[PDB]
Design an enzyme around this catalytic site. Structure first.
Site, short mmCIF file in Angstrom:
data_model
loop_
_atom_site.label_atom_id
_atom_site.label_comp_id
_atom_site.label_asym_id
_atom_site.label_seq_id
_atom_site.Cartn_x
_atom_site.Cartn_y
_atom_site.Cartn_z
N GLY A 24 -20.55 -76.83 -34.88
CA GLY A 24 -21.73 -76.46 -35.63
C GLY A 24 -22.82 -76.03 -34.68
N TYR A 26 -25.07 -77.56 -33.23
CA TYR A 26 -25.52 -78.48 -32.17
C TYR A 26 -24.41 -79.07 -31.29
CZ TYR A 26 -29.87 -77.78 -34.59
OH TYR A 26 -30.98 -77.21 -35.17
N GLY A 27 -23.16 -78.69 -31.54
CA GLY A 27 -22.03 -79.22 -30.77
C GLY A 27 -20.85 -79.59 -31.62
N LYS A 44 -21.39 -85.47 -36.63
CA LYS A 44 -21.82 -84.51 -35.63
C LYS A 44 -22.50 -85.20 -34.44
CE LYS A 44 -26.16 -82.65 -37.63
NZ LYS A 44 -26.64 -81.45 -38.37
N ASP A 139 -33.82 -71.38 -42.95
CA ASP A 139 -32.56 -70.89 -42.39
C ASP A 139 -31.43 -70.98 -43.38
OD1 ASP A 139 -31.09 -69.49 -40.39
OD2 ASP A 139 -30.49 -71.34 -39.38
#
Ligand SMILES: *CCC(=O)Nc1ccccc1Nc1nc(Nc2ccnc(C#CCCNC(=O)O[C@H]3CC/C=C\CCC3)c2)ncc1Cl
Length: 346
Positions: A24, A26-27, A44, A139
């Site tokens: 995703g 962020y990692g 996550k 977003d």
């Protein structure tokens, strides 16, 4: 300490039998069996602490999602981190495991008009709650809409969200912006900082058009090209709509352009429900002041089978206006540590 694809994924003992899902924003995201609730969950891994901007976004995501409670907004079920600030290098965010997102679904599946109608209802019902809290998502896009096996939809990723600030919305022409290009309202490129609720409605409009054909409606390749695409379909803005753009650089750019005709929605989407297209038109209005608002969109005839304002909740209180841009990463680490404390044993 558990490992997945080279990386430490340190979630146990509560969360076991991890499987990689994807990457995703962020990692690494994994699914895992939650031994307490006896369900698979999504986890996550966030490693933000070296950079103020990753810190800011992680803090926004965490504060907003913990405050919000809504069926069409992803919650946070659990947050895993080290017992002390010193030992804390990663944060793990535990959320309901969903079958897919709208991005993957649109790559692979035709949507019936009934599905489009239900997805759009759910996005707007979630957005009504977001905007009622004086928050802008900023977003919205298919990859930020999660779906389970029964097509319940949940909005995710509030990393780029802000408290609405309409009186401070004006800027110059071609001012840089963060949110995803294909879903950016035309005024972003012209004279807007994206501090009003109408920015989210444009994005929902883009999502709706994408559900109708499975292809992004305005697939710009770069910043000003996004505006080429928008104007190629909406046509040249009217004199009235140009008069609302006081900034000379923005207005003279538009005046410099050859006349473009409106492409009729029914020609772009010959198989679409005519009511869906009337609502699309209203969401994809060039002038942000004339663009339909979330509560009017819910009330639109297209959504008549679902519309029920008594079952479209609003937030108990508006969100705390803005304060993180000037906070260093060290203070931001402390705030992340503080905001995540409730998930610690006790
Ligand atoms: C909110 C934005 C976000 O976090 N998005 C994101 C992006 C990438 C990865 C993860 C997330 N978050 C997230 N995802 C889910 N659920 C999800 C997302 C994407 N893809 C899937 C999937 C899948 C396939 C299902 N598995 C399957 O069919 O397995 C078969 C395969 C055959 C072989 C062997 C036997 C096993 C059965 C899921 N949910 C929540 C979140 Cl936050």
């Amino acid at each position: 300490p558990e490992m997945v694809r080279g990386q430490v994924f340190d979630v146990g003992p509560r969360y076991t039998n991890l499987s990689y899902i994807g990457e995703g924003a962020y990692g690494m995201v994994c699914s895992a069996y939650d031994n307490v609730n006896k369900v698979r969950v999504a986890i996550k891994k966030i490693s933000p602490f070296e950079h103020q901007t990753y810190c800011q976004r992680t803090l926004r995501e965490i504060k907003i999602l913990l405050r919000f409670r809504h069926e069409n907004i992803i919650g946070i079920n659990d947050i895993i981190r080290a017992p002390t600030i010193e030992q804390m290098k990663d944060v793990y965010i535990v959320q309901d495991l969903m079958e897919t997102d709208l991005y993957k679904l649109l790559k692979t599946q035709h949507l019936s008009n009934d599905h489009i109608c239900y997805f759009l209802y759910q996005i707007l019902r979630g957005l009504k709650y977001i905007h009622s809290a004086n928050v802008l998502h900023r977003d919205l896009k298919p990859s930020n809409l999660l779906l389970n096996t029964t097509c319940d939809l949940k909005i995710c990723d509030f990393g780029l969200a802000r408290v609405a600030d309409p009186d401070h919305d004006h800027t110059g022409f071609l001012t840089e912006y963060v949110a995803t290009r294909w879903y950016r309202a035309p005024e972003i490129m012209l004279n807007s900082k994206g501090y009003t609720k109408s920015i989210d409605i444009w994005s929902v409009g883009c999502i709706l058009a994408e559900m109708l054909s499975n292809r992004p409606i305005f697939p710009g390749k770069h910043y000003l090209d996004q505006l080429n695409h928008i104007l190629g379909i909406l046509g040249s803005p009217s004199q009235e709509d140009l008069n609302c753009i006081i900034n000379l650089k923005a207005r003279n750019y538009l005046l410099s352009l050859p006349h473009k005709n409106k492409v009729p929605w029914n020609r772009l989407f010959p198989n679409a429900d005519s009511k869906a297209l009337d609502l699309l038109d209203k969401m994809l209005t060039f002038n942000p002041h004339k663009r339909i608002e979330v509560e009017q969109a819910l009330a639109h005839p297209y959504l008549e089978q679902y519309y029920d304002p008594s079952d479209e909740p609003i937030a108990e209180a508006p969100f705390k206006f803005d304060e993180l841009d000037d906070l260093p990463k060290e203070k931001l680490k402390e705030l992340i540590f503080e905001e995540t404390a409730r998930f610690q044993p006790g």
